[PDB]
């Protein structure tokens, strides 16, 4: 007679397993991104040029991408930061330019990079406020990383028509500088996809959609031996 | 004013430390010598539980030692019926950053919640059938890193801010804060008879709360880095801790000191969670080498391994009755030991 | 017989 | 229980110098990378030089390189800086600060909330 | 000096730690083993406890 | 000697056939075993590991068939439906071989697509369409063996696949070839371009050097039978349905040993049995 309570619990696997799978459907489809930036990031204008913590979905070309922005937790970062260890990329924005929040932005990043359980991750990188950077350099950099002063633009830098060269090696130094960082620790396992954008830009949607799709087929390629 | 504070919190350390060391008369190292070992432990796998994609954060036995709760990181909590391998439930999360679930003693609620800084508790047993939220907690400013129950109207939490609290789960208001800790607060532990608790945090320390008055009662300090799993001992005269350093120490909750020193040459990685046998005898921790390793409590001695997981465990824990041992780790698998 | 065909 | 007690401090005029020191206790000195923080009278802390568990690898702040200087010693479990060619912008507390874990090269220690692994700092005027 | 007010407070916890009957080490050792030698019989995971009984398998 | 037919040990199509069987039979052991590996990559290795075994065994089959009525009707019923077992066999194993090459020019093309495309449902679809199609193609290539459109279907589809398969890989190598490119060009800095060029040749070699000659045997069976050299090409025949057999023993080794998972089950069966 205990065999009624049996066939009870099969019929209730086969309604489980069955929803399982049509999730598990949606859960491969979705591309998870977190979002993180200095404190005088114009992170509200990343998410509007697109508790705890905040979730905002977008479909870019039939494609979910659902991200993720840390909200009111303690500054501590290393305890949550391993729970962001399988999203698809991490977008970090950093402001040019009180403190050297630059600094700041450099040895986050170097954390982040080398953080054992974030190997496999790639990020992307904003710097943001450009010509607040522009404005500055043209109206010091030297006071805070002297090796500018022997810094040369790129040969194959590609500066928008009207910019100030001073400010061009500016935005290269800065760059390079978390490039070193970067090319340095990475083992081919993960890349930064550094960008210069305006605090206020629709375009920034478009760069993080091709650079996932990049950072997905760079994967693949080194699946296959490909790359 | 400040430095003289400074220099009589130095002092009152000071008393403490001579006051600790007044009581160091022999080691536990040098009372269980005379004890024979529990020799070679080999477990094996029994039975394997799946459907969850993400990374499993947490799991917890109920008091009928047959049901299993599970949280991932995809926003779903699984039943699961630990003889059959059946699945009872799959409850879909507001969110999917949960760091933690508890099942009730009664078995009528679950518990769980994460990023959100809310405590998410759902009704199981429902006249319709059907699993709904019956409370949201909210009050906590970091992330929540721990849950326990301790009866169906009153429930214990931790979260990332330094601060516990008492939860009246009925009329969802906060009753009771536990403050003094300056790091995140990583793990909580019951007593058998639930009037004292541990917490454990990012600050290399422990702390033993009164429940009921809201004082912390002791102090434990010993661990070199953060602490992230906490369990008290059967009797309830004591706990285990683990850290980052990769060492895991028992405490002594009468003679506020540490007992006993848990390491080996060949372990640098942090303890995931640390649990204790029926009989207090054996120690669990695992480990971040994708493994578990079986301590003997007494001698400091390792009894044995459990291996079979290609991730990082993420939880552990052992049945009331102590039938069976079961993990999970960051492989979306969970499993039971015997 | 044979092996395959087409020999 | 772990502690870091700073030394060294005191004031100096524009062009001299100082040796900083840093006792530590209740871990293992040799396992943990090692920073030195300042907190600005009117600015929140900023890291300033960052030493690894050998002292293979030292990293500064630009603004300090070429005339601050770090060390340690593992078998004295004893953190240095020297301060050299000060000026007026170097006024400062200064901490010495421990990275959460051993064996890693990830560290968080210049949180603006109570860090665990700090010590109270020594106050240098110039 | 404003942070004074939570110094006082550490002042005032530690004052309260520094107040505990605090047990010989020895005696709560003792008490431990003994409790483990209690109950070792009655632990399956130490006890080779037979198939037949274990409802894993 | 080229006039007289070349003759081939039995005892080595038995011994490749059991080699290759044994790391067939691994191979889907391995898959079925390990519920990390259900994606859909894994199920067109699983296709493709039994299209080799079904070669191996259907060709060691008429092998010891052969040698044993030799050393000693139904004779045309045996050999009328073991050959139409091998055909079926190796029109599967090419076609196994395309849908591969599809589906990884499909992840590396369609990224961000790709788990709305190749969902389960439509892998077991498709493996099902193909065994299917190769089964009734090889049975009908058979009963009509006698016939010069089934020997020209066969080389249309062999040179076909053939073309697809090496563009598809061709076209993978330079987007990979772009990226490399990219990374390179960084301010902080074999080969990634030796690595890429080596896996192409491994991989179209080995399809073309293990298959073609028997294409070629039948592109002369139709095209110049009676010239006294295409004779002596075809007297090879025993030869080049051992190359196809050592396709069988290679390919493994290309496609499912290049996973890590695969290798750590593979080691683990190993030990165990
Ligand atoms: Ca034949």
Sequence with gaps: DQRNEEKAQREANKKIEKQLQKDKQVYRATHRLLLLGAGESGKNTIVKQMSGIFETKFQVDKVNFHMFDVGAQRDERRKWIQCFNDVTAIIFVVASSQTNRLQAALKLFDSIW???????????????????????????????????????????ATPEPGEDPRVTRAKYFIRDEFLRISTASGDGRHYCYPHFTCAVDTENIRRVFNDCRDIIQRMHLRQYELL | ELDQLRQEAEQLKNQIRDARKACA?????????????????????????????????????????????????????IIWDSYTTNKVHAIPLRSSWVMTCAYAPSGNY???????????????????????????????????????????????????????????????????????????????????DTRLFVSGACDASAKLWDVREGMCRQTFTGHESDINAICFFPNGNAFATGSDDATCRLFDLRADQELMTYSHDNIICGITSVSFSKSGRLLLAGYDDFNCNVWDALKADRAGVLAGHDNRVSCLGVTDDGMAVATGSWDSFLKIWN | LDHXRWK | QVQLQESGGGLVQPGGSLRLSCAASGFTFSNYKMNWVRQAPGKGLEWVSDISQSGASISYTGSVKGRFTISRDNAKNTLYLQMNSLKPEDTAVYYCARCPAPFTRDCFDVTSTTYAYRGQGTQVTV | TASIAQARKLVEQLKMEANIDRIKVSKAAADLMAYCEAHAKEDPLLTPVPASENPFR | ??????????????????????????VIVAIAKNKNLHSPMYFFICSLAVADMLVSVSNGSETIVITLLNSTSFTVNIDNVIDSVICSSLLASICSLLSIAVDRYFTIFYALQYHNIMTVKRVGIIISCIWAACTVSGILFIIYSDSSAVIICLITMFFTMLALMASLYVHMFLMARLHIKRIAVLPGTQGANMKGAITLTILIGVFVVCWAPFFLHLIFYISCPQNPYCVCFMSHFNLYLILIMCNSIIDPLIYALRSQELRKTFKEIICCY
């Design chain 6, 1 to 26: 000697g080229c006039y007289e037919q070349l003759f081939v040990s039995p005892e080595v199509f038995v011994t490749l056939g059991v080699i290759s069987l044994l790391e067939n039979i691994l």
């Design chain 2, 110 to 192: 679950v518990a769980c919640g994460g990023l959100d800084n809310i405590c998410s508790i759902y009704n199981l047993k429902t006249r319709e059938g059907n699993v709904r939220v019956s409370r949201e907690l909210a009050g906590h400013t970091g992330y929540l890193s721990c849950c326990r129950f301790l009866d169906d109207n009153q429930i214990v939490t931790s979260s990332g801010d330094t601060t516990c609290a008492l939860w009246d789960i009925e009329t969802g208001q906060q009753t009771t804060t536990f403050t003094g800790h300056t790091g995140d607060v990583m793990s909580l532990s019951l007593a058998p």
């Design chain 2, 25 to 77: 008369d022999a080691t536990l190292s040098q009372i269980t010598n005379n004890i024979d070992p529990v020799g070679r432990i080999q477990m094996r796998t029994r039975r394997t539980l799946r459907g969850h994609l993400a990374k499993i954060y947490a799991m917890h036995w109920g008091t009928d030692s047959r049901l299993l709760v599970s949280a991932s990181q995809d926003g779903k909590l």
């Design chain 1, 114 to 156: 080398n953080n054992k359980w974030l190997r496999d991750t790639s990020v992307i990188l904003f710097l943001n406020k450009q010509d607040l950077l522009a404005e500055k350099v043209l109206a010091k950099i030297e006071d805070y990383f002297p090796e500018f002063a022997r810094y040369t633009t790129p040969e194959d």
